Design a protein around this ligand. Sequence first.
Ligand SMILES: Nc1nc2c(ncn2[C@@H]2O[C@H](COP(=O)(O)OP(=O)(O)OP(=O)(O)O)[C@@H](O)[C@H]2O)c(=O)[nH]1
Ligand SMILES: Nc1nc2c(ncn2[C@@H]2O[C@H](COP(=O)(O)OP(=O)(O)OP(=O)(O)O)[C@@H](O)[C@H]2O)c(=O)[nH]1
Ligand SMILES: Nc1nc2c(ncn2[C@@H]2O[C@H](COP(=O)(O)OP(=O)(O)O)[C@@H](O)[C@H]2O)c(=O)[nH]1
Ligand SMILES: [Mg+2]
Ligand SMILES: [Mg+2]
Lengths: 331, 430, 442, 442
Amino acid sequence: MIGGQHKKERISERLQNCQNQPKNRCYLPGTQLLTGGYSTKTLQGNWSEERADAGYYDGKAIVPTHLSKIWTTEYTVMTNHAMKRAQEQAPVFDQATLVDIVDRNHRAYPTHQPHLDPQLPKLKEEAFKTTMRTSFNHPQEVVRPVIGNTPAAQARAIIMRFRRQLLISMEGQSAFPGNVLRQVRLALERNDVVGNGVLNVEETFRGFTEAGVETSIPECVALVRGLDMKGDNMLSIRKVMDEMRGEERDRRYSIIEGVYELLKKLCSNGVVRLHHLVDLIDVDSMESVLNGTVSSADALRAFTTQWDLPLEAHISFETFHTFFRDSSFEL
Amino acid sequence: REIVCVQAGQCGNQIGSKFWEVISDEHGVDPTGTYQGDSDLQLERINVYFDEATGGRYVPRSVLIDLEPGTMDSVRAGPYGQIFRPDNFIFGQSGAGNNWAKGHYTEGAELIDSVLDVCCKEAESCDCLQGFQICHSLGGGTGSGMGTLLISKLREQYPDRIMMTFSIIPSPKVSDTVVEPYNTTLSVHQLVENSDESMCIDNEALYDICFRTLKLTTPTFGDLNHLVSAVVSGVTCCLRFPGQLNSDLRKLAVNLVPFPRLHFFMMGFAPLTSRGSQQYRGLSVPELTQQMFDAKNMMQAADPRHGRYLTASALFRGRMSTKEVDEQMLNVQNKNSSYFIEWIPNNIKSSVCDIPPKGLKMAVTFIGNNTCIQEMFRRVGEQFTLMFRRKAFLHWYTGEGMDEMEFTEAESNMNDLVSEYQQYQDATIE
Amino acid sequence: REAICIHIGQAGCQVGNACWELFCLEHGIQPDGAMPSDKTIGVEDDAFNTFFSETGAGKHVPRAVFLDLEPTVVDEVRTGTYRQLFHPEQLISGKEDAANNYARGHYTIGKEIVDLCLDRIRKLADNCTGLQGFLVYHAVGGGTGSGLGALLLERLSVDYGKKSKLGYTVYPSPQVSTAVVEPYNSVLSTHSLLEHTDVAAMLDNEAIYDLTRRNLDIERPTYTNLNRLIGQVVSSLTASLRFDGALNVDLTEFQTNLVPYPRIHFVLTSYAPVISAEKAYHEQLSVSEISNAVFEPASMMTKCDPRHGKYMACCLMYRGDVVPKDVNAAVATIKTKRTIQFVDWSPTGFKCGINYQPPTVVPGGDLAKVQRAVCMIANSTAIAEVFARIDHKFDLMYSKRAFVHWYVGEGMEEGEFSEAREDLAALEKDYEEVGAESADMD
Amino acid sequence: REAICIHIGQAGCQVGNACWELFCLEHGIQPDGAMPSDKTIGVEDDAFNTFFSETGAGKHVPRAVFLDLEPTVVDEVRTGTYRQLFHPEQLISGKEDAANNYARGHYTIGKEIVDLCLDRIRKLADNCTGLQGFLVYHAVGGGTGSGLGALLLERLSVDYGKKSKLGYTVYPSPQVSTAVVEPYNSVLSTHSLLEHTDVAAMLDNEAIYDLTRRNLDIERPTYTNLNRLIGQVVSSLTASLRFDGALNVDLTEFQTNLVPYPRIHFVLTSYAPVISAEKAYHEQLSVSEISNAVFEPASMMTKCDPRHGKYMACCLMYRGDVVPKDVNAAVATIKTKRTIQFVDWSPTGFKCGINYQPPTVVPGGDLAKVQRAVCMIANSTAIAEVFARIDHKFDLMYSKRAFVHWYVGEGMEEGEFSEAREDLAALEKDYEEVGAESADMD
Ligand SMILES: Nc1nc2c(ncn2[C@@H]2O[C@H](COP(=O)(O)OP(=O)(O)OP(=O)(O)O)[C@@H](O)[C@H]2O)c(=O)[nH]1
Ligand SMILES: Nc1nc2c(ncn2[C@@H]2O[C@H](COP(=O)(O)OP(=O)(O)OP(=O)(O)O)[C@@H](O)[C@H]2O)c(=O)[nH]1
Ligand SMILES: Nc1nc2c(ncn2[C@@H]2O[C@H](COP(=O)(O)OP(=O)(O)O)[C@@H](O)[C@H]2O)c(=O)[nH]1
Ligand SMILES: [Mg+2]
Ligand SMILES: [Mg+2]
């Protein structure tokens, strides 16, 4: 730790007038941890293992000197870029834990260093578990492969997981099919702050959490990196929604295009508007209304609202196509 | 099923302090003696090593014996020393003087009755008593003489229980005392008749463990005693925790001893790795088994590669599959078939316990019955024959009162033990 | 109607946990002993009675005893999840183990525990009105299972007499091994078991490890997997007493059809649709496919190859959606095969059973859900190979009196080794004579 | 699916630093062996396995050993920034250098260090399940690279046998030179490499200096630039094992396609889009331009002119956005050219590979970012001119025994010089005979 302060004499040692070798702590004058006749600063003997100690400290001041800058090795110049990033994080202990480390209290063998083991807390929670208690609990209480390190692979896997979660959940089911993806898109749009239709990692996380999907920050980092095509870590809402709809089969496309071509010929100048669709639809023929579980007026009202357009808006083929890909997601 | 511990002499008291630190840590006992653990699994077998004191406290079932109180003042001053019961410390007023005859005949017979009274008071308190465990050095004076006297008396008073010993034997390279051969010879003669199971440790082997495997720059006796405390606390783990295949000291003896005199065993503990390397290699059953059979990891100077295994036992701690353990033990027996005695169809017993030591995912302790134990005794007998032909220091022993005939009997008995191991090493089916 | 289960030692108690988990989940008893009251049930039912008895308050309690000399495993059962299901008197535990010594269990320590066990079994047998046999689970490799199992079977055989005793023993694996003294304990156990058992189902661990590696996709199996497979086998055999079916089979019919001579009661076992959930949806599982599966040695739960011997009798139990005509077509196709041979004195080699209840699926289990299954128990001379190898290992150790001082010191005469070894030699000749085709007749 | 890297001496370790920097940055492993949380989410991948193995805690450690007789370069690795990436046992260092003496490395000093190296490689090779070759980096101009590289390749070749060994070797350039004894060490090294290597890639520093002056605009290059170019070449050859592609090429297919006779295994290497950012934005870089570029001698990394010989085989690896039809059109256009000639016994002269992963860009690097690249390794008779020049320099010094007393003092017979010189003379005659324009029918 900085400045030592755990290699120094303790008050109990001073009061008891303790000597050196019973505990072999080199702090008294004239005694020092000599490896090969020299200090650990010199590369002789067992310096590598002594430098691997949990309580090791090197006397390097944080404020640097001039000759350190002047005298550099070619290897240091080659590998300095990674060193600057690698020096950001390091484990730290308080003084009581350092006292425990120096006194080497709880160890299976003399060289066992449990404080340097990153899996210690899960070991502690995992301790004192018996085979039967794990294997004989209460019986009531108890994926397409994707290959490659490419970010596109990660994005595809995450998209598939999200789609499966939405199918099993099915929030916001309406009287007319096609409201799940609408709710997800609206939730994403609501958390945009700028107005240009792009999102970053944190807003993506908040939006997908509001939409009902359980995620984490690394998931959103991977997704935004995978779907990025212009190098700015911005996520386009249109692109992600198009990927959430998925690949479309041929029969559904054929029916959609046939219906659109039929509707085109019944209008003037081949321009179709939304009130045409509202007037011409035959809502009382669905299986959900003839069986007797959804009223016809409610179904028509649900259909009219899902377009998110005024009654005089021009409905192109793109809007019709997208609307009925959204609806096919539930059938 | 309770064990009673006896700690004798300087080495025994020092190893015992580290052992009781390890056991108190594993069961979450504070150095004040208060239970502070975090799972009920720790409490249901606390009785095995601890007695219950009234409010929160637990007291350890151990007897401390020594001829000069210097060690007792050192152990009472240690970090866990307060836990020990005051009435369990028995001491005299003058040292053993490194002499077996003084420790066995003059101050031994004077103090032994008070120690037997304490051991009986401790023994009769158990609801069901398991074997005794003894720690002592064979090269010393009070450890060898009074330890073997006490072992003989407890074997007379409790012949149906188990007798287990951990024993320190003189290194082949540097002596700490000039008269080591006499004390060692008399002690091995007493042990081969009295003991049920005996473990032997060379300090040179612990130095080689520290320097080659752990790469410590300046090891101390605390490290050697920590390795010993680790294996001793490990052998009894299946007695005091649940597991898929429970084991017991009597079950170990029944599987390890083919004939009653062949009860001297070698020890090893597997997870050992340097402070720099531990982040670089994960624990797994193949890694533990390969280190477990490497002779570099065995705590005696004789190496198994010059002998053959009659029998061996491995106790594994942790949640792991039994198939991997069984297939590893089959693979090691099949690939190295020349090193296993052929008239026994399966030499290794396995046992599995669910709870590993804190901070380790898995661990195994290994006990081995190998004929290479004959090499240590032969070397001690050589040094004895060089010293005895010239009566090098015999007047001390004769002045205490010993007859020279005891030396010739002890030499003959050790020579017969070496001969019996050598004959089974070179035995054949015919 | 009723059956009493006796569990001995470590393997028997751990296998008991899996068995009672299955019987609870199949009947629907919760871990606290109370069935879900629901709204109502249209008609009264009784199938649980074979394994459970109800109190006046409607709690269920099972007809079983757990016997051990060491406390740890039974205390582990006492502290587990099913604490309220078992009656506390049924879980009997001693102070110390038999330390892999058959002599310690039989002569010194089991003699103290047998009277408590006999008093508990008497109290169970008094609360029955149609008891039709004992099922016993134990391992012969350990000390208490062999010694106390033999002593208790002898006492049960004198007190209850003609009542049947069916054992599901776990004998030592042919190359995987766990303890050095396994041959002595297995030989001495087999000597007592020969005179006092009606049908011995023999199981090995190396076969169930092979079955879990090859068919299921588990690289590192543990005893809970093996015990769940054994529990499935026991549920299949006892289903004939508990549910409606086309052709029921009472436990006396197994002994009548499967055992030709009173000493020839060692049998082999095999279970067909061991399959994982991912493989299960790519394949149909018709009657003929599982019937073809049960005869391959890769399906067996014991380590022996039946192509090196001759079958004497087979009993095939089908449960689930099966129609008798498909069973008949399958058995006729098996009979056509040239690598399956029967001794010429057994022309009608098969017994069939058909039950409508499909196998139950356990929440943490590894088997898939399937509409039909078949289980087989068969008598074959290939079981001689299992003994000859244990006897050879015994001969190797006994030539130097290996470890013998433990057995003679704990109270057993050295003469006991020679009588048992000669009895197993006679069992080898029984398998030689029964397997002989014909003599020189006119 | 796996490869082990062995780095020897100064050039091999310094080129290794650039290689491992690149492989880490291409996979995404941090300098401390970890991998960020977003690379390991959503999908589970194994592509790192060719070069890294993971511990059970998820740390990555690389499959390489570093061998040196002087401590300085390995101590630079031990105290630098990548200290935590490598396992400390893998970094092996001796006490003193081989002092430009092949004899000191091979006979006197390497004999002490070689057994630790073999123990580390054995411990690594036992923890593998699809090892598919050894990659070796060394320079033949120095003492330890020549002597210890030869001794270690001999021992590896006896212990592992048939497994392939591919070497990247820096040979002495034709006029720039750094030490006087380079010809002796290069001849004695080449004698060992003939028997114990499957493909040998030849490099000259003078060619990489010319390429860095001509294509990039660097007037004063240093070893880090050359080492980064070599690392790019190695990444191109090993990309076929690690990423998806249209036409994969396994490391055994290189050896099968490139070597016609067992001694003719020395290949030339070149790389196409070595370009600066200012030129890269002035030009399109279609497949046909880089295919035409790889055959110009200005693109080669070895100082030889291929117009003085005939090609026997070429292997072209394309990585990035390329479609097979343009590769076919390009190869047909190259085949049309009159200054490119193939031996008449090799009519089908080309092997192609196409991989989708584009080349990675290193933060301090000097190469531009490009969508596609091609790398070529080819076998040609022109390489015989390099050996003839080494033999002329050897003959000049050896006629008067200019420095032989050092080699004789360190343990070598004077006869070994004449043996090696006669073996390399036979290699020159092999390249004369194999390249014969035609054989007569009579
Ligand atoms: N299949 C299976 N085998 C088991 C199980 N438990 C133990 N075994 C095997 O049975 C043998 C050990 O027998 P144990 O039941 O432990 O012996 P014991 O009855 O406890 O006898 P003692 O040790 O004297 O108490 C070994 O071969 C084990 O592999 C289990 O749950 N399932
Ligand atoms: N491309 C490149 N060439 C190098 C590098 N280091 C040395 N060389 C060249 O390789 C030759 C020297 O070989 P060395 O590697 O120094 O020899 P060595 O392996 O150290 O052998 P010893 O001197 O005995 O230790 C000269 O032609 C150098 O120009 C390097 O890092 N990169
Ligand atoms: N391993 C170990 N050996 C010890 C320790 N203390 C003393 N010894 C050894 O034991 C021998 C001395 O025996 P000692 O205990 O003094 O005999 P005593 O005088 O009868 O108590 C020497 O070989 C010492 O090296 C210790 O803490 N650990
Ligand atoms: Mg038991
Ligand atoms: Mg050098």
